[PDB]
Design a protein around this nucleic acid. Sequence first.
RNA 1: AAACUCCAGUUGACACAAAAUAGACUACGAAAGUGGCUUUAACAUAUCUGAACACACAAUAGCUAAGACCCAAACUGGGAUUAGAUACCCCACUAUGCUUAGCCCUAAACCUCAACAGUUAAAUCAACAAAACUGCUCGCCAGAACACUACGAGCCACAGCUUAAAACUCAAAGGACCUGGCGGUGCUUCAUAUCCCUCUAGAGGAGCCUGUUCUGUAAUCGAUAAACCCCGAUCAACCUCACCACCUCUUGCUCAGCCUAUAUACCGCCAUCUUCAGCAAACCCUGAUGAAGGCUACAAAGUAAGCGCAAGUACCCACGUAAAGACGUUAGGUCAAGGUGUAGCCCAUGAGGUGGCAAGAAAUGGGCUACAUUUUCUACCCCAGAAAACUACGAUAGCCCUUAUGAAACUUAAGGGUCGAAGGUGGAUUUAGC
Lengths: 326, 52
Amino acid sequence: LHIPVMVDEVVHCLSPQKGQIFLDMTFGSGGHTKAILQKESDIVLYALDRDPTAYALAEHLSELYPKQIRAMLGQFSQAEALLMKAGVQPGTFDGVLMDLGCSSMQLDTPERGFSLRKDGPLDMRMDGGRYPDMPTAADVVNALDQQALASILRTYGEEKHAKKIASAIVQARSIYPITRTQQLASIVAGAFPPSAIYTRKDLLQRSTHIATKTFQALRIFVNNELNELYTGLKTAQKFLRPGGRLVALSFHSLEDRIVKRFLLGISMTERFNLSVRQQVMKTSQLGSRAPLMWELIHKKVLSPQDQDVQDNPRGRSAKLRAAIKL
Amino acid sequence: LAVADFGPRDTSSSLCGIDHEALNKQIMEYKRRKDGRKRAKPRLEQDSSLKS
RNA sequence: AAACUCCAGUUGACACAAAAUAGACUACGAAAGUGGCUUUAACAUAUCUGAACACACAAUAGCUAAGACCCAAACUGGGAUUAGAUACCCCACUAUGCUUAGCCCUAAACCUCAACAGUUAAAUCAACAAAACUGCUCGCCAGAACACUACGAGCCACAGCUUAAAACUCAAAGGACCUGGCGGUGCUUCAUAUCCCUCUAGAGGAGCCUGUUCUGUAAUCGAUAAACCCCGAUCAACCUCACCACCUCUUGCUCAGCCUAUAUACCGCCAUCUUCAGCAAACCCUGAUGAAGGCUACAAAGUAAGCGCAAGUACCCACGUAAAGACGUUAGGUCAAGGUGUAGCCCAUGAGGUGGCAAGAAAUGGGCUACAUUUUCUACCCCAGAAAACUACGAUAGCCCUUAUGAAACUUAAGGGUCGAAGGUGGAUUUAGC
Ligand SMILES: Nc1ncnc2c1ncn2[C@@H]1O[C@H](CSCC[C@H](N)C(=O)O)[C@@H](O)[C@H]1O
Ligand SMILES: [K+]
Ligand SMILES: [K+]
Ligand SMILES: [K+]
Ligand SMILES: [K+]
Ligand SMILES: [K+]
Ligand SMILES: [K+]
Ligand SMILES: [K+]
Ligand SMILES: [K+]
Ligand SMILES: [K+]
Ligand SMILES: [Mg+2]
Ligand SMILES: [Mg+2]
Ligand SMILES: [Mg+2]
Ligand SMILES: [Mg+2]
Ligand SMILES: [Mg+2]
Ligand SMILES: [Mg+2]
Ligand SMILES: [Mg+2]
Ligand SMILES: [Mg+2]
Ligand SMILES: [Mg+2]
Ligand SMILES: [Mg+2]
Ligand SMILES: [Mg+2]
Ligand SMILES: [Mg+2]
Ligand SMILES: [Mg+2]
Ligand SMILES: [Mg+2]
Ligand SMILES: [Mg+2]
Ligand SMILES: [Mg+2]
Ligand SMILES: [Mg+2]
Ligand SMILES: [Mg+2]
Ligand SMILES: [Mg+2]
Ligand SMILES: [Mg+2]
Ligand SMILES: [Mg+2]
Ligand SMILES: [Mg+2]
Ligand SMILES: [Mg+2]
Ligand SMILES: [Mg+2]
Ligand SMILES: [Mg+2]
Ligand SMILES: [Mg+2]
Ligand SMILES: [Mg+2]
Ligand SMILES: [Mg+2]
Ligand SMILES: [Mg+2]
Ligand SMILES: [Mg+2]
Ligand SMILES: [Mg+2]
Ligand SMILES: [Mg+2]
Ligand SMILES: [Mg+2]
Ligand SMILES: [Mg+2]
Ligand SMILES: [Mg+2]
Ligand SMILES: [Mg+2]
């Protein structure tokens, strides 16, 4: 079982109260959505997900609360149109809970293809066939050139060995099609000496497969999570009430940066991890930020309790960024 | 600028860092189609001029 | 931002902290060190050398105890930046820097030059540093690494200091210098249809033509980043043809033949920098006759020749445009122009006949025609009349029918008829032109 990550913080943060309408742009399993419909019995809630399996769960769970929860299906970009059909263009949503990442059910079910450990079709697509033409991870690896595929790994996977892990994929695909998760994992391992398979470690300091950065990289290029995250936040702002509390959850750095640089106005094209020294050097050259539209409830990113991390290691990297619209 | 007459006075491609559009265009075309060695030290290179 | 707001400014009072200028001086001391003022004491030796351990010292940091505390400041806390943590930045503050009394005994404690005496003549001298040496004495060294380590021993030192190995391992390690490459290297001047902006017309969007890719097919090959992509072709209905299927021939058009492999064996002919100005010899001289170097015009070691540039020539000039453009670079292109080295086939990888492929789910390059009013049609070749939005502009496309060529034409070309589509001047990007 997967407990909703930081459910206690997200509930306190949004303080759901009677007379307030809320949105959920990532229903998924619905653990967070259900934790929010428990504290306040008079709450109004809206749900959304990219997975039709997740949208069916919400529809089945809608029986528990007939109108307090309203289920919707679609991507972040398509969310505004879907909600615009309802007619809530101003929205006046008190809070938008934009949980991020892959659902526990999505990656616990081997058929969905998200787990390298198990053997499933190399789908790695949050979409559940709602768009049967949407390329899957298998398609991405078999088509793109080394330079193109290396960029996917480098930019989205934070993978130093992008050229080494991409060349192995290019050679492997020629010999046979890459259609299964384990088939890819073995190819990526084959780019390195056999001992490399578990040399790398996580921040938890527990050995991880040497292809855990290629499964994350493709997952984010197949589902365009990063570009869809920028529109998703923007749409929330337009549909978010003034004085309404937004709450995001970033499990990896790339998504965390966008949430940080969006709630603070920082340009998305600035250099990453800028030090104070570099900031001085940057502006010294020019010598020769706009008003913020948010009020961060908690100034610094929250993180899961160390005890809770061991119980749910999947959510160890959950960085909660809360803000109030201005 | 003081002399001048002003008249009567009243994307995501860079965000990710990859050409996500161009990458997904090549995949669509694919979907349609289907559906070291030793080097000798130069000073030690052997010559036969003296033997000739 | 935080912090402060008994804050900040003026004025006055006020140090156990630190000592502008002088100091561009180069002094004192054994070294370490010593640069505000005064006073006291005071800077060993009438031959030199003489210690890891004796004797006495020894920056900074640090230890123990007691004081001082302006300012600085490891650490720590807060703020900020950061995906986040630490650091870099900001604020506050501590050990510590100070005094006293004990320790600790280290430094790139380095003029990286042991002390003393002597010489400037020999050879000046591997190199660099810092001109080259002689006598004499003490200390020290004997491949790299292991190793400022282990053990032993001594020490007020207890995560310490001093002295200091061996085994296993290697064929180098190392010093100086030269060249090249490279620098998130300095400065300087640059590109002239160009690196960017600026100027004009385009490409990228539409249709069509054409190449390529992919897919398809029993059914060629080669080119394929710049430097491939209307390229070998100044050109494929048969032929061409090298491909596929079937059939046929065997000293075969040839004193046979092979478009069989290898352009990474080559000649031949070229691409490319080149919208370059350099390349290769023969000598001479400098550096001690080292790797190397060789220019000063009021000239200081360079020079008599070759190739390219240049000149000259072609076109309408002496301008411009052609042509030319070395060596070298990319084992660049071409064995399928022809020839040919090497390897392979010889009833077959050779030769001949018949028929056939040469398509489009698509993607992409180049071009053509357009989207119209500076336009469309007609007359005229520039003083006109009409057209001008769903019967306008717009196909060189589709379909149908003629004609031309041919033995052969749904197929190639031209013409006519019919049809009247997308397109409404095209994002990122990009081509050409003085
Ligand atoms: N661009 C997007 N638009 C909509 N839903 C998305 C999305 N990207 C991811 N998602 C979905 O959002 C969920 C995030 S992970 C699951 C979190 C959820 N609150 C839970 O019940 O666990 C997944 O269901 C995922 O498929
Ligand atoms: K002074
Ligand atoms: K001075
Ligand atoms: K020194
Ligand atoms: K150099
Ligand atoms: K155009
Ligand atoms: K050649
Ligand atoms: K040939
Ligand atoms: K040959
Ligand atoms: K074109
Ligand atoms: Mg403040
Ligand atoms: Mg003496
Ligand atoms: Mg001794
Ligand atoms: Mg001594
Ligand atoms: Mg000593
Ligand atoms: Mg001392
Ligand atoms: Mg002290
Ligand atoms: Mg202070
Ligand atoms: Mg103090
Ligand atoms: Mg003092
Ligand atoms: Mg000193
Ligand atoms: Mg001595
Ligand atoms: Mg000399
Ligand atoms: Mg030795
Ligand atoms: Mg030491
Ligand atoms: Mg020791
Ligand atoms: Mg000992
Ligand atoms: Mg076009
Ligand atoms: Mg071809
Ligand atoms: Mg080829
Ligand atoms: Mg070739
Ligand atoms: Mg090339
Ligand atoms: Mg024939
Ligand atoms: Mg033919
Ligand atoms: Mg043949
Ligand atoms: Mg060649
Ligand atoms: Mg002439
Ligand atoms: Mg001329
Ligand atoms: Mg020419
Ligand atoms: Mg010439
Ligand atoms: Mg070659
Ligand atoms: Mg031949
Ligand atoms: Mg044959
Ligand atoms: Mg018309
Ligand atoms: Mg026609
Ligand atoms: Mg005829």
